[PDB]
């Protein structure tokens, strides 16, 4: 049986993927780049703060100074951090709190595999910190999503092999990172966005311990 579940945060635990999209789109438009729509944003889900800004600049074949790049990333983060101040336990996605409780009752380890430097603050806002056996620090890994490093680090932090873990993700980059770690991915979203080659569920109510067992067994 699987021995750990490795959680993405934004778009899996709560609706902060929407917040990141709105913030990046506002930033892009301030600098005169209008291509950041929902379809383009599928390429930004899972990707780090600096990598996201670079993808937006590259979309428009735009170059900025190193000083301006740093300011833009900070500006977006400052806006996003203001956006999330009122996040609360009421914003936890359907199924997620009960899943965490059921995993702990069954002695299955729980680790955060998020790229977000705002992850710890968000888990505290949602009264979820006490469910987590480890939080992988994204500043410590040498490579970010779609590289598998963050999922590998999360598994190691709870003493479990990636091959005996399930990863939960809403992003193209993150699904690839789970695949390359050795863990089993279960995606949440549209197969049109996430692929027809892994198990995908339409919303997080589907993330029950019963279903995770169903998928693991086959
Ligand atoms: O800017 P932060 O809080 O470090 O977040 C980094 C990344 O975290 C990931 O979880 C999101 O899917 C990305 O959209 C985001 O860019
Ligand atoms: F949406 Al994440 F790390 F929380 F990619
Ligand atoms: Mg996500
Ligand atoms: Mg604790």
PDB file of N, CA and C and ligand atoms in Angstrom, residues 8-11 16-17 20-21 24 41 44-50 52 73 76-77 80-81 113-119 122 138 145 169-171, ligand 1:
ATOM      1  N   UNK A   8       0.681  18.956  -3.869  1.00  0.00           N
ATOM      2  CA  UNK A   8       0.729  20.338  -4.361  1.00  0.00           C
ATOM      3  C   UNK A   8      -0.240  21.179  -3.517  1.00  0.00           C
ATOM      4  N   UNK A   9      -0.037  22.505  -3.491  1.00  0.00           N
ATOM      5  CA  UNK A   9      -0.927  23.434  -2.752  1.00  0.00           C
ATOM      6  C   UNK A   9      -1.917  24.160  -3.662  1.00  0.00           C
ATOM      7  N   UNK A  10      -1.414  25.008  -4.556  1.00  0.00           N
ATOM      8  CA  UNK A  10      -2.285  25.913  -5.297  1.00  0.00           C
ATOM      9  C   UNK A  10      -3.101  25.103  -6.302  1.00  0.00           C
ATOM     10  N   UNK A  11      -4.418  25.189  -6.202  1.00  0.00           N
ATOM     11  CA  UNK A  11      -5.316  24.434  -7.064  1.00  0.00           C
ATOM     12  C   UNK A  11      -5.577  22.994  -6.639  1.00  0.00           C
ATOM     13  N   UNK A  16      -6.053  28.937  -4.805  1.00  0.00           N
ATOM     14  CA  UNK A  16      -5.030  29.965  -4.992  1.00  0.00           C
ATOM     15  C   UNK A  16      -4.395  29.928  -6.393  1.00  0.00           C
ATOM     16  N   UNK A  17      -4.594  28.865  -7.192  1.00  0.00           N
ATOM     17  CA  UNK A  17      -4.177  28.919  -8.601  1.00  0.00           C
ATOM     18  C   UNK A  17      -4.884  30.086  -9.307  1.00  0.00           C
ATOM     19  N   UNK A  20      -3.026  33.346  -8.280  1.00  0.00           N
ATOM     20  CA  UNK A  20      -1.765  33.470  -9.009  1.00  0.00           C
ATOM     21  C   UNK A  20      -2.012  33.932 -10.451  1.00  0.00           C
ATOM     22  N   UNK A  21      -3.022  33.356 -11.113  1.00  0.00           N
ATOM     23  CA  UNK A  21      -3.407  33.748 -12.478  1.00  0.00           C
ATOM     24  C   UNK A  21      -3.785  35.233 -12.520  1.00  0.00           C
ATOM     25  N   UNK A  24      -0.585  37.444 -11.952  1.00  0.00           N
ATOM     26  CA  UNK A  24       0.368  37.427 -13.073  1.00  0.00           C
ATOM     27  C   UNK A  24      -0.199  38.187 -14.264  1.00  0.00           C
ATOM     28  N   UNK A  41      -2.145  30.424 -19.288  1.00  0.00           N
ATOM     29  CA  UNK A  41      -1.878  30.184 -17.869  1.00  0.00           C
ATOM     30  C   UNK A  41      -1.672  28.703 -17.516  1.00  0.00           C
ATOM     31  N   UNK A  44       1.825  28.236 -16.953  1.00  0.00           N
ATOM     32  CA  UNK A  44       2.352  28.880 -15.764  1.00  0.00           C
ATOM     33  C   UNK A  44       2.058  28.100 -14.480  1.00  0.00           C
ATOM     34  N   UNK A  45       1.012  27.271 -14.466  1.00  0.00           N
ATOM     35  CA  UNK A  45       0.711  26.501 -13.253  1.00  0.00           C
ATOM     36  C   UNK A  45       1.887  25.600 -12.917  1.00  0.00           C
ATOM     37  N   UNK A  46       2.250  25.569 -11.639  1.00  0.00           N
ATOM     38  CA  UNK A  46       3.349  24.731 -11.166  1.00  0.00           C
ATOM     39  C   UNK A  46       4.746  25.312 -11.260  1.00  0.00           C
ATOM     40  N   UNK A  47       4.898  26.369 -12.058  1.00  0.00           N
ATOM     41  CA  UNK A  47       6.197  26.957 -12.353  1.00  0.00           C
ATOM     42  C   UNK A  47       6.547  28.013 -11.297  1.00  0.00           C
ATOM     43  N   UNK A  48       7.826  28.102 -10.923  1.00  0.00           N
ATOM     44  CA  UNK A  48       8.289  29.045  -9.895  1.00  0.00           C
ATOM     45  C   UNK A  48       8.013  30.516 -10.245  1.00  0.00           C
ATOM     46  N   UNK A  49       8.195  31.392  -9.261  1.00  0.00           N
ATOM     47  CA  UNK A  49       7.911  32.824  -9.447  1.00  0.00           C
ATOM     48  C   UNK A  49       8.772  33.423 -10.573  1.00  0.00           C
ATOM     49  N   UNK A  50      10.078  33.192 -10.514  1.00  0.00           N
ATOM     50  CA  UNK A  50      10.987  33.751 -11.520  1.00  0.00           C
ATOM     51  C   UNK A  50      10.770  33.096 -12.878  1.00  0.00           C
ATOM     52  N   UNK A  52       7.995  31.881 -14.001  1.00  0.00           N
ATOM     53  CA  UNK A  52       6.719  32.385 -14.497  1.00  0.00           C
ATOM     54  C   UNK A  52       6.900  33.758 -15.174  1.00  0.00           C
ATOM     55  N   UNK A  73       9.048  40.803 -10.198  1.00  0.00           N
ATOM     56  CA  UNK A  73       8.738  39.617  -9.398  1.00  0.00           C
ATOM     57  C   UNK A  73       8.274  39.992  -7.996  1.00  0.00           C
ATOM     58  N   UNK A  76       4.653  41.563  -8.145  1.00  0.00           N
ATOM     59  CA  UNK A  76       3.619  40.529  -8.250  1.00  0.00           C
ATOM     60  C   UNK A  76       3.424  39.825  -6.916  1.00  0.00           C
ATOM     61  N   UNK A  77       4.521  39.475  -6.241  1.00  0.00           N
ATOM     62  CA  UNK A  77       4.391  38.802  -4.952  1.00  0.00           C
ATOM     63  C   UNK A  77       3.709  39.679  -3.912  1.00  0.00           C
ATOM     64  N   UNK A  80       0.041  39.544  -4.653  1.00  0.00           N
ATOM     65  CA  UNK A  80      -0.499  38.205  -4.315  1.00  0.00           C
ATOM     66  C   UNK A  80      -0.629  38.030  -2.789  1.00  0.00           C
ATOM     67  N   UNK A  81       0.379  38.487  -2.053  1.00  0.00           N
ATOM     68  CA  UNK A  81       0.369  38.374  -0.600  1.00  0.00           C
ATOM     69  C   UNK A  81      -0.768  39.195   0.012  1.00  0.00           C
ATOM     70  N   UNK A 113       4.586  19.336  -1.200  1.00  0.00           N
ATOM     71  CA  UNK A 113       5.510  19.430  -2.330  1.00  0.00           C
ATOM     72  C   UNK A 113       5.130  20.644  -3.184  1.00  0.00           C
ATOM     73  N   UNK A 114       5.150  21.812  -2.548  1.00  0.00           N
ATOM     74  CA  UNK A 114       4.777  23.073  -3.224  1.00  0.00           C
ATOM     75  C   UNK A 114       5.993  23.926  -3.582  1.00  0.00           C
ATOM     76  N   UNK A 115       5.913  24.564  -4.746  1.00  0.00           N
ATOM     77  CA  UNK A 115       6.900  25.561  -5.182  1.00  0.00           C
ATOM     78  C   UNK A 115       6.747  26.886  -4.433  1.00  0.00           C
ATOM     79  N   UNK A 116       5.634  27.077  -3.722  1.00  0.00           N
ATOM     80  CA  UNK A 116       5.285  28.412  -3.199  1.00  0.00           C
ATOM     81  C   UNK A 116       6.013  28.745  -1.921  1.00  0.00           C
ATOM     82  N   UNK A 117       6.749  29.855  -1.923  1.00  0.00           N
ATOM     83  CA  UNK A 117       7.371  30.349  -0.704  1.00  0.00           C
ATOM     84  C   UNK A 117       6.335  30.859   0.296  1.00  0.00           C
ATOM     85  N   UNK A 118       5.111  31.111  -0.198  1.00  0.00           N
ATOM     86  CA  UNK A 118       3.968  31.455   0.649  1.00  0.00           C
ATOM     87  C   UNK A 118       3.197  30.232   1.211  1.00  0.00           C
ATOM     88  N   UNK A 119       3.710  29.023   0.983  1.00  0.00           N
ATOM     89  CA  UNK A 119       3.036  27.802   1.430  1.00  0.00           C
ATOM     90  C   UNK A 119       2.802  27.733   2.931  1.00  0.00           C
ATOM     91  N   UNK A 122       0.054  30.047   4.052  1.00  0.00           N
ATOM     92  CA  UNK A 122      -1.261  29.547   3.603  1.00  0.00           C
ATOM     93  C   UNK A 122      -1.792  28.368   4.442  1.00  0.00           C
ATOM     94  N   UNK A 138      10.964  24.936  -0.858  1.00  0.00           N
ATOM     95  CA  UNK A 138      11.294  25.081  -2.273  1.00  0.00           C
ATOM     96  C   UNK A 138      12.543  25.923  -2.548  1.00  0.00           C
ATOM     97  N   UNK A 145       9.767  22.678 -10.593  1.00  0.00           N
ATOM     98  CA  UNK A 145       8.887  21.934 -11.526  1.00  0.00           C
ATOM     99  C   UNK A 145       9.007  22.484 -12.959  1.00  0.00           C
ATOM    100  N   UNK A 169      -1.788  16.776  -8.015  1.00  0.00           N
ATOM    101  CA  UNK A 169      -1.421  17.965  -8.831  1.00  0.00           C
ATOM    102  C   UNK A 169      -2.569  18.434  -9.729  1.00  0.00           C
ATOM    103  N   UNK A 170      -2.586  19.754  -9.975  1.00  0.00           N
ATOM    104  CA  UNK A 170      -3.500  20.386 -10.931  1.00  0.00           C
ATOM    105  C   UNK A 170      -2.798  20.927 -12.175  1.00  0.00           C
ATOM    106  N   UNK A 171      -1.476  20.747 -12.293  1.00  0.00           N
ATOM    107  CA  UNK A 171      -0.703  21.399 -13.364  1.00  0.00           C
ATOM    108  C   UNK A 171       0.033  20.436 -14.286  1.00  0.00           C
TER     109      UNK A 171
HETATM  110  O1  LIG B   1       5.418  33.070  -5.726  1.00  0.00           O
HETATM  111  P1  LIG B   1       5.259  31.823  -4.868  1.00  0.00           P
HETATM  112  O2  LIG B   1       4.337  31.955  -3.684  1.00  0.00           O
HETATM  113  O3  LIG B   1       6.603  31.326  -4.385  1.00  0.00           O
HETATM  114  O4  LIG B   1       4.550  30.659  -5.827  1.00  0.00           O
HETATM  115  C1  LIG B   1       5.273  29.927  -6.856  1.00  0.00           C
HETATM  116  C2  LIG B   1       4.468  28.954  -7.730  1.00  0.00           C
HETATM  117  O5  LIG B   1       3.790  28.045  -6.850  1.00  0.00           O
HETATM  118  C3  LIG B   1       3.055  27.039  -7.545  1.00  0.00           C
HETATM  119  O6  LIG B   1       2.397  26.251  -6.551  1.00  0.00           O
HETATM  120  C4  LIG B   1       1.973  27.656  -8.448  1.00  0.00           C
HETATM  121  O7  LIG B   1       1.269  26.647  -9.209  1.00  0.00           O
HETATM  122  C5  LIG B   1       2.597  28.641  -9.423  1.00  0.00           C
HETATM  123  O8  LIG B   1       1.557  29.293 -10.154  1.00  0.00           O
HETATM  124  C6  LIG B   1       3.446  29.655  -8.644  1.00  0.00           C
HETATM  125  O9  LIG B   1       4.145  30.533  -9.550  1.00  0.00           O
END
